[PDB]
Amino acid sequence: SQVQLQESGGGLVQAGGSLRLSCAASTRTTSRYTVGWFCQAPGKEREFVAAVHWSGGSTWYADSVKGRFTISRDNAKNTVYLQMNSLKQEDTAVYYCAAAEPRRYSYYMRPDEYNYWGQGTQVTVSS
Amino acid sequence: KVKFDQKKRVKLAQGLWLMNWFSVLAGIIIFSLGLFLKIELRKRSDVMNNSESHFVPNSLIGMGVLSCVFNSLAGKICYDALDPAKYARWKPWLKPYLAICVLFNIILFLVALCCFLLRGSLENTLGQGLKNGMKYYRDTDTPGRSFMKKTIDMLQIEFKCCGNNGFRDWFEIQWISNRYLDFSSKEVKDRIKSNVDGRYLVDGVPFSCCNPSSPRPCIQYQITNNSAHYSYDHQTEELNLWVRGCRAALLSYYSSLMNSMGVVTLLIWLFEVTITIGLRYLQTSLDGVSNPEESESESEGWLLEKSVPETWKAFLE
Amino acid sequence: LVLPLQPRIRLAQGLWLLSWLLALAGGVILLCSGHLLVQLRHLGTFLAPSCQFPVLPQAALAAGAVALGTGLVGVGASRASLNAALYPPWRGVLGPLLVAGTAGGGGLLVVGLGLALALPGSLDEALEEGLVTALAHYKDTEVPGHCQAKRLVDELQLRYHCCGRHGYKDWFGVQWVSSRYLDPGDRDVADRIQSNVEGLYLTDGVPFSCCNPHSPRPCLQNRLSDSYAHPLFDPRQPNQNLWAQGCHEVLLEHLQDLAGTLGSMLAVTFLLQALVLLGLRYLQTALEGLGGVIDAGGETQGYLFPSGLKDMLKTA
């Protein structure tokens, strides 16, 4: 049936802290799914944050957050993990994990492409 | 007429053997080409009607086989003629051999001419088959018909054609299955009401009709509606879709193929007639020589020592 | 090695037939090299400029030509065996000719094998770069120097049943319609241009060539991201509309298959040539003692080298 994506880990944090976010799927084919994350806050539109693809050795993030974030995949648990490091107040937003069928030549992704979208989780950073 | 000696006769025999081997090669190559034409025609059998225009290929195959066998026989005849003792047993078959070679040449000329003349018949059957395929295009799910859509699309893609005569036929004939069309749609219902006998007719073409060379992305809907796009006019612009009908494209392709085959067959006919002339001259020399064993003695060879009017009366008797 | 006359004749016949097989191998490898070259004729644009894969067909043509020449020389050796008196005139030249043939064939075939075993590795990144370049040049169908980009890309897609490098989706992220044909009066187009950075026009659509004939439904080429945009399409993998596999993938697999077949052909041809040359050299050294007379039954010794190995080292 239709796949469902569930996100968890969202919670209040202090400025400069780190956090863990986990997005989980339901199918057994996750190894081939290409996954990405988006963050949107009031007054701003959906924006790309991090991506992972079939190979697993490819990871791409927005220049504004290059290096500061980390994204990884666990096929055994069919989970996508994102570690927030050196957070800032402006990062406060609602995050959405998205999964899509193999699109394996635009290593960069945009919302126009992804198909399965989770509900998302709200994360707030306080000074 | 012409004179002959032992050296001229033996050189002529050697040349006959060599040209006979060349003719065997020609026969095998024409056999291969005829088989290639047969398979090529069979490939597009589905898009056209089940069976149509399968006479020229079979004639070509039979002609090639006959050419090879006759060339081998004539080579053996030349080998025997090299030795008068061996040829002695061939004395009472020379006239029948000449006759059958003549008939072979006439039938070769006939098939050569047919290779050019017969092209006309294929046109109507090909057009009818294409129309039937277009009709069956929409109903893919029907058993024994799903292959039709794929065949038509592949044919269009690989031949740069579009329908029977362009895109007007595509406009006329529905090509979208009912199930994949929303009947509750207001515009779809209006179109079905406007068109008689129901069915959905919208001026457009399948993607295959599109031309890669078009600078714009190919337009497949509202093509007639000039205002439906930007800086476009169906009357003026042509590169958007291929304009040559698929009937014409297939006809031209097969016509070029058959013309090439006819040229090859004509060359083979020249070779065969030369071989026949050589055989006739050899037989005339062997008749003129007092005895075959007197190869050293001079002889005379001709084409026909009887005047045309005399032959006219002789044939009548 | 003492070679009696009857084994000498049998070895001459074996060398004749082996040379026939070598000539056939040369012919088939030449045909395969020509096939690869003609295939690359309309594929170079999709190869990265830094790539050197097209040099492999060029080398293979020379290797096949040399192999065919060696096969013809073996046929000549068989003819000389048939006519002993025909060998003497072909005695002095035979030695240097065989040496040069061995050197050239070995060098050419080894170079071809090395290229077939090395170049294909780079094909991955070569196609990776080339297809991206072609797609980026897809939009500019009017600018001179790239007009062939659109036609070549569409022909590639249609011929090899593929869409983009890998997949089709983020094709939406590359503009594929020349701005010259955009209507400035469209509010949606203006809004998209303003929203997207760099002014590129990104649309949820694909070019016609991306469609699949197998599709039961007419091909869909717009609003592919929305589930309700059409009566039956959905994000669930549809067999219909566009292809599944990607160009880069299909092209890489096909080119690697061709390279592997050509490498196997090169290896078999190299083994056959080595055997043929070994046999021809043994035949030459054996008949050297006989003086070119086959009927002679002196039992000449056939040795690969003219003299001892240490003699060759000292002569250096």
Numbering used by the authors:
A (entry chain C): 2 to 128
B (entry chain A): 5 to 321
C (entry chain B): 7 to 322
Share the article's original sentences.
For single-particle cryo–electron microscopy (cryo-EM) structure determination of PRPH2-ROM1, we expressed and purified PRPH2-ROM1 with mutation C150S in PRPH2 to avoid oligomerization and added a nanobody to increase cryo-EM particle size. PRPH2 and ROM1 dimerize through a head-to-head assembly of their respective ectodomains yielding a molar-like appearance. The interface is formed by the respective EC2 regions and buries a total surface area of 1195 Å2. Helix B of both molecules are facing each other, held by a pair of hydrogen bonds between PRPH2 Lys153 and ROM1 Ser221 and PRPH2 Ser218 and ROM1 Lys156. A hydrogen bond between PRPH2 Gln224 and the carbonyl oxygen of ROM1 Gln227 seals the heterodimer at the center of the interface. The PRPH2 and ROM1 display classical tetraspanin EC2 folds, with helices A to E, but are extended (compared to other tetraspanins) by more than 80 residues forming loops and two short helical turns, h1 and h2. The free cysteines, PRPH2 Cys150 and ROM1 Cys153, are positioned in the AB loop and are freely accessible for potential oligomerization. The C-terminal extensions form amphipathic helices, residues 312 to 321 in PRPH2 and residues 315 to 322 in ROM1, which are positioned at the micelle-water interphase. However, the C-terminal tails of the PRPH2-ROM1 heterodimer could not be modeled fully, with residues 322 to 346 of PRPH2 and residues 323 to 351 of ROM1 being too flexible for structure determination. Density for a N-acetylglucosamine moiety was observed in the cryo-EM map on top of PRPH2 molecule indicating glycosylation of residue Asn229, while the map suggests possible glycosylation at Asn53, although this density was less resolved.
